[PDB]
Amino acid sequence: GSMKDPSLLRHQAYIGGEWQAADSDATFEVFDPATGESLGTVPKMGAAETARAIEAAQAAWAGWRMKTAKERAAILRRWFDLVIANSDDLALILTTEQGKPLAEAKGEIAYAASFIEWFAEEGKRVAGDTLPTPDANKRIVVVKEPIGVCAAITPWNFPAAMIARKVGPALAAGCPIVVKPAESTPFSALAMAFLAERAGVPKGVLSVVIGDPKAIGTEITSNPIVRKLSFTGSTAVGRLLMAQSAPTVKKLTLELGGNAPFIVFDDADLDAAVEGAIASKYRNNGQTCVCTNRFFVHERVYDAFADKLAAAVSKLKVGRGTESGATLGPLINEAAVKKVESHIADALAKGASLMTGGKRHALGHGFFEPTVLTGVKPDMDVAKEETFGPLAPLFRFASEEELVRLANDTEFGLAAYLYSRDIGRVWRVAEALEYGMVGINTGLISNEVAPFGGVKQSGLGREGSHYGIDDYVVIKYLCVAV
Amino acid sequence: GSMKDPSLLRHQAYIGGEWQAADSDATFEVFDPATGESLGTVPKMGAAETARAIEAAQAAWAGWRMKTAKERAAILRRWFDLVIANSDDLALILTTEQGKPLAEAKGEIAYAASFIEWFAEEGKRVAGDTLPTPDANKRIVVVKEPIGVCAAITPWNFPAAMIARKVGPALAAGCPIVVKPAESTPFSALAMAFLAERAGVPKGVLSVVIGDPKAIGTEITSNPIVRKLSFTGSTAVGRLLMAQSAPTVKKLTLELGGNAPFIVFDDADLDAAVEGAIASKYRNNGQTCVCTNRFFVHERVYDAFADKLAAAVSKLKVGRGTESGATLGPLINEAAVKKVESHIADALAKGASLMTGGKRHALGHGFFEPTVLTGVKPDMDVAKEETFGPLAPLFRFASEEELVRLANDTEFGLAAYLYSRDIGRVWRVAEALEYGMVGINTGLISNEVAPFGGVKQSGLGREGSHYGIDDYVVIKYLCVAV
Amino acid sequence: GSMKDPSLLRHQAYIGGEWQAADSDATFEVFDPATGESLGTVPKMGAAETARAIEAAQAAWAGWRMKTAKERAAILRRWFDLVIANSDDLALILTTEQGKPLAEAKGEIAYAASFIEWFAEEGKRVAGDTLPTPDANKRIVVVKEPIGVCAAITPWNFPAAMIARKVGPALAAGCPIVVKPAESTPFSALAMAFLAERAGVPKGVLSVVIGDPKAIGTEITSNPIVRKLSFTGSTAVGRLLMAQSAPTVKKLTLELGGNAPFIVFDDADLDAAVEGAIASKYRNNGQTCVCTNRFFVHERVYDAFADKLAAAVSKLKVGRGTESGATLGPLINEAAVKKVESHIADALAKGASLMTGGKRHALGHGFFEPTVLTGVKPDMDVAKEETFGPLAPLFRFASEEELVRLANDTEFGLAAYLYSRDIGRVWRVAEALEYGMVGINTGLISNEVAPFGGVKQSGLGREGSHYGIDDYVVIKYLCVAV
Amino acid sequence: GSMKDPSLLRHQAYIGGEWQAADSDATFEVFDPATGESLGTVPKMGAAETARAIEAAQAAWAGWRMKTAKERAAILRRWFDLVIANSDDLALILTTEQGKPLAEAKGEIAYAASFIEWFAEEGKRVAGDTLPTPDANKRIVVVKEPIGVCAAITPWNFPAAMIARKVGPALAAGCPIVVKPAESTPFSALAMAFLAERAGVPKGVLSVVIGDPKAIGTEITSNPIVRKLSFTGSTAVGRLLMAQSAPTVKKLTLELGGNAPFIVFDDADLDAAVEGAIASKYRNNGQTCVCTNRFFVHERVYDAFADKLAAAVSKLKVGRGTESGATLGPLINEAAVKKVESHIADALAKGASLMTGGKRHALGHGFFEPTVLTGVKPDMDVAKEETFGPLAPLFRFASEEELVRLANDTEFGLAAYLYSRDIGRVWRVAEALEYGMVGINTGLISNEVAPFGGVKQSGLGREGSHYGIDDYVVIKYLCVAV
């Protein structure tokens, strides 16, 4: 009702090119995380409807792959344009359902938009090889072709970007895709589906399914038609999805939990590290995959860094995403708040000091006071688990050799940040760090052209860049007798 | 004992760079598939020995990865030369335990060697990117680094080559590897470990563990130290290994089962076709992963191809691998023979016809008569199972639409072969075929410069070429503030 | 004149981002090649004006290269959109000043636009390297940066497309460019430049200089600020420009003359070969760099091919470009008419038989009759020179060995065309052909994704594809102590 | 004389696979630059002898290109294996003919051999692409093939490594090569040619021509058979060869002259910067092309740098190459000595001061005292010209912005060196420097895996790395109708 185009808010799922309600007419409700008020209902679908979405995708494949990359890119770039054109609404829809301040959601829409554009262009560059033959009577030619029907289970913390990142490459490679978005935040996904429809995406090529994650998830992983699956969420769930895809040996991309260390050295520019700490810890209220989970600060600047950070934090305003000056929104749901409190409680019981914040905000719901902790030790839960909230735990380190042992002492290896001004120390530490991504004197590393992903328990594959499309195609060796 | 160097025949496993028997002193016996005799005993190890193997690898990693690509190349190249130098003995050991003729045994050592050399060279070429930044204040640098400790489980059909194909890339990358080879053929695996040891491979970088396939398998898949696992074998086991590797989200390479179509068209050169048929079918007594399973012949040339194939097959000489003039050795075990008999009896029952062979060979043991069958229809078992024996089942087709349907009518998609003279037809059929590898006017396609692997249920990833090494490295994004 | 945007027609040059007359008010006239009428005037500049353009490009470079690839892509994309939006006007200017039919000029405007788009995207993908080091205390990083001020000299046959193919990859790579279009068709370049102003290309980044070919040329080649030059035209002038460019060791793209053989084999589809002949021979009245210069038809199908070619030639309509249905415009000038005459007269004199046309057309001016010749032999002038007109010289041949020798008996090696069905003969002949580009069973091969360029005396470098931007960047190796 | 294999010293040229004296039986003499004592005679050949070597190259091409890359690699690896095994004598030949210390000569042998190895491996990896078509009816296939007959003209500073830098990539590409080495140091070329003959390099594939620089060069550049030319030497000669090659549009690789700045910033590790000064200024007695020509040291560190520099120069023992402890052999000839003295006198005349050296060494001939100069300004000769002698001229600088202007105030741009410890500065400066190669906190940059070459008047193309082979091959685009 508050949009230039209210038909962007959808209360039906998108199955095989058609807008539909659940087969049983079951629906669940979606609430504004800041106010708690109802935003309406969406379908509560399951295995049967997902099966139809998968079949449709299979039936849509031959016609979609038969197009040139240039043609697919004409549709994708039309989709891109529509996303740009409806920027203000898409952002409002997102802010309302997910929480983040309008400025951040407009960032997310432009961010999302750029993945569509990037993969439109990449589609035209998926390239094979002609190679030198080891046998004179033979020639070697290698081509690439879409893998088949793709599926993707996206999370709630970036309800729009996550759709573009997973839809973009599949369609660009010549694949149809079935997407199950997060139950918390389905509107942003459906808003994308609707604009993709307008752009001229053929029926079946794109499906957004909404309902029960075990029912839909189970169908996706057991269905032999689905040849590749992408999942961005918790490490725990990702391990299970790998197990359920094992019977049909699916090609997997897994984007799992992190535990980002953010390292402020002896010789770092302190102010800039503080600028980069606010960005890497407090944007999206600390709920991103890439968010700092552990601060490691050198003895010799610990005291000075902590003050500067405490100051910086106190200039951040908490309030509803639609209010001006507002930079920290609510935590997504009730369970998110209880997690932060748990980490704070564990730290306090183990000897930590509350520098600032530490409790729920008076505005209620998901709002939580930006928190800084000092004297954080590695026996505390925050050393081993992700907070997913606005909490800055500061560990102390003495030596570069101790740091690397500290930073790496974790199951996960997604993002990592490092502030130092010495060229040789930067490399030595960056190289030693078991992480897929490393920010060097920057707190913001995410973009469309760089390969995004983790190592170790943070999963498999890479999204964005020229590396992004690789997982969505499969390779063919042609050995030609001459 | 008929070797220039009798110490190549090993009866102890190679753990952490130490020759050791099982912790409980247990053993199992290896037999000669051609003559039934005893080739000796090897350790029957299990979990605990594999665990020490795995820890040894981790202990060895820091040192091995800190060598330059060139320094690693030196050692691998010495191992190459040592494998070349000891070709005859390696060929004898291989024939003795596996069955294949000496010519094919020597063929494999040569093939195995070229992999070692190839990856030695590739290691010096594993490369990252520098990409144009989307932010003026930042710089994008991409680097590649070893994933971690690797594991490989290899089969018996190529008990030397498979070792080079999986040890080679790992080491080149900068990875240590634990290798559990087939219990039917362990000596080939050990002999190269022995030659690798002499080449200067430091202790812990290579292990060859021998014994209980389930116990050793479970240890490998559940151990968190193992970050990537390669497996070549049956699709049924591949699926389970992917399930078992899930709790740790390991990088998987799977070279699983196939169901190769050999395709003879209207305008094929029949004499060339028959030459390719014999080679793609009767290599290694039909026991390669890429062996023709289903012959599809066009109705115009069906009777002529059948007569020419039948005549050629009947002139092939069956004997023990060491016997000069013999081109067909034994099937590996009793189970293999019975499978071939089952496939024949099945086809015969359903109305097919015997053209040559069909029975077990007078020499007994694993010796089976090279067999050709006409009148084979898609309802017969061999249409859906791999034979892994010297059986040419001739199916029949009329059109180009029909053949694509029939050839792709399987869960598998490894190797396929296509004989036709029309360029337009060649490309058309090569694109429509869902296989990772396609021979065009040839029946021999396997080399070290071409990427080897399948699609669908044939597996994940590629081996050989510049593609082979990518699954042993992990990529790192560096965002550098400017 | 009679266009939606009359201001698209330009009568001033674009020196350093500002529209200017010659320093000395001098001009020269431009005439319609179909009807001889004065189309208006354009400046007659030289060394002085060219030096300001060059000096302007250097002043603009710092601010242009400082933009992200993303940003430059946007500006080029705005230019792309305008080129598409104004497609109809830009066609008529092109037809009016060059002569080719409207359908063809429209086709060229799209071609031209597809190039702007392509390099907009390639600009974002110019990539360097991180390499495995051969000395453990060092690290190798390769990066790529714009070369510097570029210059381009373009021909008259594609006066829209050539501006796109040279301005596109330059600006995309971070490079400024000074252009001198063919003084026979300068409006099409000026129009493009005008739309680039509208797109927001910063003053100095683009310059279109018009006037004395030799003075602008000699100033381009003598000036040390021009670090790279791109030339598309005759081999004669290409050889001179390389020499003039030696004292500053410029980077050179040279797209020179060809002598394209059109090869029709024994077992070809005759009807597709005729379709191929029409498009490769008579499009833009035989005035393209890739236009067939010599037909080689197998003895066995000579008459059959000649008859069908004669029939299809007669089906073409000669007339002015603005008239509907007209498929053949005039030859761009009188000297071009005299070249065609010179070639025909020589063929007859040495024994060739005329089969259609052979003289100038009734419409006068540049109009010449569609011409086919038979009994053509290697002693003829057309065997060694490019006609650049609607002349189809048919040569005879009796074998594969003989064809390769005939097709290669030339100093040139740009485009070549081959019609055959036998997979084995295609590869043998395609490989044996000393040409940069080979069309197989097609007569049209020009597009944005493929590397366009020749070998031998046809020049150096490649335009388009991902190879196209590479000559516009210089590579820097950074050796970094650890 | 005193060499394990006295037949490595050749007094005859190598033409088309046979050792010949000139047609006219003319010769000229080769002296030791440390004693003046005659080392023997070599043929003084001309056009006629070159022309033959070229024709023999054209003849040998087909049979050389026909071999697989692996087959060519086995021949190149035996040549590698013969250079390593005979490195002792080859070093001694090199010292004797050129001057540099025995130990340095050995480093060059191992350096030259590394190139042979690298390209043997690279030849196996020359790759084309398969690209996504913009037209459904067509397929895009790109292959690479050898360019044809290659010529190389090599200088004296590296009489062995330069041979291998040009021959390796050529033979690996599938080309034959005619090499004319420096008239002053021909024995390294000839010894390696001899080894190549023994290695199994087919006759005609490699020729080494000795005689009149002007006569041989002119034949090479005028002959249309020669389709590409690789040159390393002075910029002046480079400009002439590009002019001479213009009538036939030859593909050029030009490694031309430098003007390297070694930059010592405020925050450098001064001891390490000295270790890099010594390594970049006095290696090969200042006679390398990547030699430091201009030292730029910051105001704060100026004094302290100079003191430490002279303090390391005193440890450097000038002596004949065979004497133990000799780290500085003689310059090549009197003309080089006259040049060093020319700069020193001009610098003194304009204000500079002598720190150490400044005179001819007692030993005479072409030995010269290692010289350091303080108070050098831009107005001096050594500021614009290359010394090619042991002369460290120390320039003073204040701001960063100033340094970039001074460092780039030259037409040349091969190597640059940069010492600084601030990550941000290293990147800002290294990006701003107009040079093909920049060394970061190191004086030694040259190796086989990195792209070697310059920008601006320093030439065209790259040597070593995967980029090295690209200039030896040609791109063929195949547009296949399907």
Side-chain angles (χ1 to χ4, degrees), chain D residues 45 84 95:
Chain D
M45 286 165 35
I84 298 294
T95 301

Side-chain angles (χ1 to χ4, degrees), chain A residues 129 138 239 247-248 430-431 433-434 436 438 440-441 444-445 447 457 462 466-467 475-477 479 481, chain B residues 129 138 144 227 239 247-248 430 433-436 438 440 442 444-445 447 457 462 467 475-477 479 481:
Chain A
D129 312 276
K138 274 154 193 165
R239 284 159 177 154
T248 59
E431 281 189 31
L433 286 165
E434 305 215 277
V438 195
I440 293 164
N441 306 315
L444 296 170
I445 50 164
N447 64 76
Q457 296 302 282
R462 290 290 186 276
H466 71 87
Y467 291 105
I475 93 148
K476 182 174 271 157
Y477 160 43
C479 184
Chain B
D129 303 76
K138 283 162 201 193
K144 292 194 168 83
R227 277 172 192 175
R239 289 164 172 149
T248 45
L433 285 158
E434 296 185 308
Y435 290 76
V438 184
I440 296 169
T442 188
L444 287 166
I445 59 174
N447 61 72
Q457 303 300 274
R462 290 287 175 282
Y467 290 102
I475 111 132
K476 187 182 283 179
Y477 164 41
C479 196

Side-chain angles (χ1 to χ4, degrees), chain D residues 319 321-337 339-358 360-362 364-376 378-383 385-395:
Chain D
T322 32
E323 190 217 292
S324 284
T327 68
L328 293 179
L331 284 104
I332 202 193
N333 62 34
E334 260 293 307
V337 181
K339 192 48 143 275
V340 184
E341 287 181 314
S342 180
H343 281 163
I344 294 161
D346 162 81
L348 261 317
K350 271 154 172 165
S353 267
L354 181 61
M355 177 146 210
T356 182
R360 317 170 73 102
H361 197 275
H365 296 310
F367 281 98
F368 201 91
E369 296 192 331
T371 305
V372 188
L373 282 165
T374 78
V376 192
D379 61 15
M380 302 181 184
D381 282 359
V382 70
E385 261 183 352
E386 262 176 293
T387 309
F388 254 77
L391 179 52
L394 309 194
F395 295 67

Side-chain angles (χ1 to χ4, degrees), chain B residues 243-274 276-314 316-319 321-337 339-358 360-362 364-365:
Chain B
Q244 287 156 41
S245 315
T248 45
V249 166
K250 308 200 190 306
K251 172 66 173 160
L252 273 321
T253 275
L254 300 178
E255 313 269 302
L256 315 164
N259 185 4
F262 189 107
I263 302 159
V264 182
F265 268 101
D266 204 344
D267 61 342
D269 178 326
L270 278 350
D271 276 336
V274 167
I278 291 292
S280 59
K281 177 73 230 186
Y282 299 98
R283 177 118 311 186
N284 201 22
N285 217 4
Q287 311 204 84
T288 89
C289 29
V290 297
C291 274
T292 294
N293 197 51
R294 299 175 291 150
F295 278 100
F296 289 96
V297 186
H298 193 281
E299 223 131 2
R300 272 184 265 235
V301 299
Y302 188 92
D303 307 327
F305 175 78
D307 293 344
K308 279 184 201 278
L309 182 62
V313 177
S314 71
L316 299 174
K317 195 180 169 287
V318 175
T322 22
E323 174 184 304
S324 171
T327 55
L328 294 151
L331 264 17
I332 186 140
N333 58 44
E334 246 284 306
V337 180
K339 189 80 139 291
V340 182
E341 297 207 293
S342 168
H343 273 194
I344 296 176
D346 166 71
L348 262 46
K350 284 159 185 185
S353 327
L354 200 38
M355 218 155 177
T356 184
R360 289 147 100 112
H361 192 275
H365 284 83

Side-chain angles (χ1 to χ4, degrees), chain A residues 58-72 75 145-146 171-176 202 205, chain B residues 431, chain D residues 132-139 482:
Chain A
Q58 185 169 68
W61 186 26
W64 175 249
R65 67 176 300 177
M66 207 167 66
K67 285 182 196 280
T68 56
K70 186 167 207 197
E71 283 164 350
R72 296 191 281 265
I75 296 164
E145 46 188 53
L171 268 57
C175 294
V205 170
Chain B
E431 286 180 10
Chain D
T133 191
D135 191 298
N137 294 325
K138 281 153 199 194
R139 293 300 177 273
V482 72

Side-chain angles (χ1 to χ4, degrees), chain C residues 197-202 204-213 215-274 276-314 316-319 321-333:
Chain C
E197 179 158 58
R198 288 201 199 159
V201 177
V205 174
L206 177 59
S207 290
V208 175
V209 190
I210 298 164
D212 187 295
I216 304 160
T218 305
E219 170 57 38
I220 282 166
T221 60
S222 65
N223 202 308
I225 298 167
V226 166
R227 280 166 189 185
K228 93 138 275 139
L229 162 73
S230 193
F231 180 59
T232 308
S234 72
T235 310
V237 175
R239 290 160 161 146
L240 293 163
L241 292 168
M242 184 164 168
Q244 290 164 29
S245 303
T248 57
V249 184
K250 307 196 179 309
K251 184 71 144 277
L252 266 63
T253 297
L254 292 173
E255 310 262 339
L256 307 179
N259 193 3
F262 196 101
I263 303 147
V264 179
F265 262 92
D266 197 36
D267 75 338
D269 181 320
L270 269 322
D271 289 292
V274 165
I278 302 300
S280 79
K281 190 59 230 193
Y282 294 96
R283 96 146 22 184
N284 198 22
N285 211 12
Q287 290 174 137
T288 71
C289 334
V290 305
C291 261
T292 293
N293 200 66
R294 317 171 273 146
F295 285 96
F296 292 96
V297 193
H298 202 299
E299 215 159 61
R300 321 207 236 239
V301 288
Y302 197 92
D303 286 294
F305 179 82
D307 285 346
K308 299 191 177 216
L309 177 65
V313 162
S314 80
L316 311 173
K317 204 177 202 269
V318 193
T322 50
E323 182 190 52
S324 296
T327 49
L328 285 170
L331 267 9
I332 213 216
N333 70 22

